Amino acid sequence: KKLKLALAKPALLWKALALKLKKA
């Protein structure tokens, strides 16, 4: 189950992407 829509919305919303890269 590969959610290819991950490059559609999160890749257009760096607010939850950049802080996601700020993981640990």
Backbone as a chain_set.jsonl record, in Angstrom:
{"seq": "KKLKLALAKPALLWKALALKLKKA", "coords": {"N": [[0.849, -1.212, 0.0], [1.195, 1.734, -1.188], [1.252, 5.068, -0.62], [1.081, 7.292, -2.813], [0.188, 9.843, -2.858], [1.507, 11.294, -1.096], [3.384, 12.9, -2.101], [1.959, 14.898, -3.071], [0.232, 16.481, -1.381], [1.629, 16.887, 1.249], [4.051, 17.655, 0.168], [3.407, 20.046, -0.735], [2.949, 21.467, 1.366], [4.977, 22.62, 3.422], [5.128, 23.2, 5.969], [4.37, 21.13, 7.645], [6.235, 19.463, 6.801], [8.903, 20.328, 6.828], [9.219, 20.571, 9.565], [8.826, 17.992, 10.042], [11.045, 16.831, 9.056], [12.624, 17.78, 10.979], [13.012, 15.751, 13.056], [14.39, 13.566, 14.926]], "CA": [[0.0, 0.0, 0.0], [2.047, 2.903, -1.319], [0.482, 6.298, -0.696], [1.772, 8.205, -3.722], [-0.349, 11.185, -2.649], [2.398, 11.91, -0.121], [4.152, 13.882, -2.851], [0.974, 15.828, -3.606], [-0.211, 17.423, -0.353], [2.734, 17.223, 2.162], [5.084, 18.3, -0.634], [2.879, 21.371, -1.03], [2.753, 22.008, 2.698], [6.28, 22.386, 4.015], [4.946, 23.466, 7.384], [4.357, 19.828, 8.291], [7.265, 18.684, 6.132], [10.176, 20.793, 7.356], [9.188, 20.203, 10.975], [8.857, 16.537, 10.03], [12.47, 16.588, 8.882], [13.101, 18.046, 12.329], [12.51, 14.6, 13.778], [15.243, 13.21, 16.057]], "C": [[0.873, 1.246, 0.0], [1.214, 4.154, -1.579], [1.234, 7.353, -1.499], [1.271, 9.644, -3.599], [0.477, 11.95, -1.619], [3.267, 12.975, -0.783], [3.228, 14.929, -3.463], [0.602, 16.902, -2.585], [0.928, 17.838, 0.589], [3.877, 17.949, 1.453], [4.647, 19.699, -1.061], [2.576, 22.104, 0.273], [3.997, 21.736, 3.531], [6.243, 22.654, 5.503], [5.008, 22.164, 8.176], [5.428, 18.916, 7.699], [8.635, 19.033, 6.695], [10.311, 20.416, 8.824], [9.152, 18.684, 11.127], [10.291, 16.068, 9.842], [13.198, 16.877, 10.192], [12.556, 16.972, 13.272], [13.325, 14.354, 15.05], [16.368, 12.301, 15.579]], "O": [[1.246, 1.753, 1.058], [0.561, 4.283, -2.615], [1.932, 8.198, -0.938], [1.863, 10.56, -4.17], [0.186, 13.105, -1.307], [3.818, 13.845, -0.109], [3.66, 15.749, -4.274], [0.652, 18.094, -2.888], [1.182, 19.035, 0.726], [4.583, 18.755, 2.059], [5.416, 20.443, -1.67], [2.025, 23.205, 0.278], [4.065, 20.743, 4.256], [7.204, 22.373, 6.219], [5.621, 22.103, 9.242], [5.517, 17.741, 8.053], [9.432, 18.147, 7.004], [11.377, 19.995, 9.274], [9.416, 18.154, 12.207], [10.703, 15.045, 10.39], [14.247, 16.299, 10.476], [11.751, 17.251, 14.161], [12.992, 14.869, 16.117], [17.205, 11.883, 16.379]]}, "num_chains": 1, "name": "protein.A"}
